Amino acid sequence: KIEAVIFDWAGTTVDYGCFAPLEVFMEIFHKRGVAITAEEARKPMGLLKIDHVRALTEMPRIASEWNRVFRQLPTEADIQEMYEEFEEILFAILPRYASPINAVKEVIASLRERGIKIGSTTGYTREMMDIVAKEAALQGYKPDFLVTPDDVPAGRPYPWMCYKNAMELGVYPMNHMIKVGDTVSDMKEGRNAGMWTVGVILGSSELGLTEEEVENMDSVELREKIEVVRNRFVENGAHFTIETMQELESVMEHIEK
């Protein structure tokens, strides 16, 4: 029944905990004397990078501190300067985050043996993806297809990129495909496309932890942050949720019944 699985990139396939963008947003502000925290930086993590910045700008705690430094509130010009800077820095360090999350590679290998096609969509622009995809392929991961917002009329949560994949992979109907992501938007997109939607937890942008803090966190404590997200997913359309990609072929087996 299931002939293809469509994977997201950041916090699903690579970039454990999806920090690259977080790391950058913090820098552009820190260098302006208005240092923000991972929480509020990740707070928006889900909309256009351009609008993501503007969001931080309108965050009362940040807005005030900005008006303290520059003796004035952010200007549409500032947003545009901070956005240009965001990209330049992101391009620069994107390679350092393009490593396949330790579990994933073997999983992909297993699915390909079952004759199951591998697709993918993303929030990163084609420019960014070129860089991310290149480093990931060297490091062992390369989907059969990839699409970015640039390829379509609009990115997430629209199902456009998902249809493009089905088109190229040659798979139909949409319920013969699974969408796997690490954020609310990933769930929306999956449903809007009429496909089986799943959500990874450990290493997601939602769980926001690094491999380090995960391997060295209080079990009880961690087993709780996992739920604030696993639940968070189902509350957005995830026909299912998995702590790790190691549970993927299992969900497939379930679905196919």
Added chain:
Amino acid sequence: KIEAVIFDWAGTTVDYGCFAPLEVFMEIFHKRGVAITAEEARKPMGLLKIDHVRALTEMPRIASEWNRVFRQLPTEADIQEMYEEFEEILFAILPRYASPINAVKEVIASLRERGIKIGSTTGYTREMMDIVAKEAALQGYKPDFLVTPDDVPAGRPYPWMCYKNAMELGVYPMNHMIKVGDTVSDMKEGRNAGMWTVGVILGSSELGLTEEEVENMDSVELREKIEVVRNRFVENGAHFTIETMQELESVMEHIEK
């Protein structure tokens, strides 16, 4: 609630009985000393033209007859040559086959007044549609969007053309769109695409009759042929069937339940 209707062209919105291609397909085979019947000629109607030709040669009855006449099955060269001919003959007559089927325009206008999007897919190439769509517009019919196989990996039965229509009209999921066509390939295209599928009988390729033949036929005989086409559309996936486009609106309402 439905938001868009994707109409096929010939036999559905224009060219009553889809006659434009008919004699060209029979002519190309008749020059080789291999006669075919309209039924055969019409079987693959709706598919991309080159595919339609290849499909004809695939047909046992025809393949055997060709093998017997030439002492070998049809070749890619044969196919490619007949196609080159098919195009020459078709192009010089296409303008004469872009007239809207009688009451279709009232329907369309009614759909628009209800805020419904109008998309379309076809088996004709982009070059062919240039002629057909131009003439159709002058005669008052012009959907919001048009898609030929030249815009996607493949034509019918694949649901690719339907997805582009969805991307353009910005409608999702596919279950919010209805597909209307006059052939078997139109039916398989709707179910494959995951939308509500409908087949129109009077004027359809499948009915293969002209307006004269339909208004001057033994009523009893007529209702009987309608039944075969009808049974045929369903047999191939149609969710509902209608005799004319006047019924469409009503089937939409039924579905909205």
